[PDB]
Amino acid sequence: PQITLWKRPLVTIRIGGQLKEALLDTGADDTVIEELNLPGCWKPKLIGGIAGFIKVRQYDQIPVEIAGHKAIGTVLVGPTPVNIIGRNLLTQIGATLNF
Numbered sequence: 001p002q003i004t005l006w007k008r009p010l011v012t013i014r015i016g017g018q019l020k021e022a023l024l025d026t027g028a029d030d031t032v033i034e035e036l037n038l039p040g041c042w043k044p045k046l047i048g049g050i051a052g053f054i055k056v057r058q059y060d061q062i063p064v065e066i067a068g069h070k071a072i073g074t075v076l077v078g079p080t081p082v083n084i085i086g087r088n089l090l091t092q093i094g095a096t097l098n099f
Helices: 087-093
Strands: 010-015 018-024 043-048 053-066 069-077
Antiparallel strands (some): 010 053, 053 069
């Protein structure tokens, strides 16, 4: 699929058995998902944005379907305002920028 950028590139994802909306963010190194009691063990991390940092829970080897495409990798969980799919998972689904 091709996604134009007139509006925010929001898509449906599946994680932990739950469906969520997420932003495809080529400016994010990592994937950051809203408060969700994701089973399994996690560890602390701090991640930075434009204004500062937030504390998140790093979970590894988490299956995540993005627009029907299976991926599996690291998911950071915390009080992000927007669920974000970053490059760690975008690469797994073969996503490119084209112009």
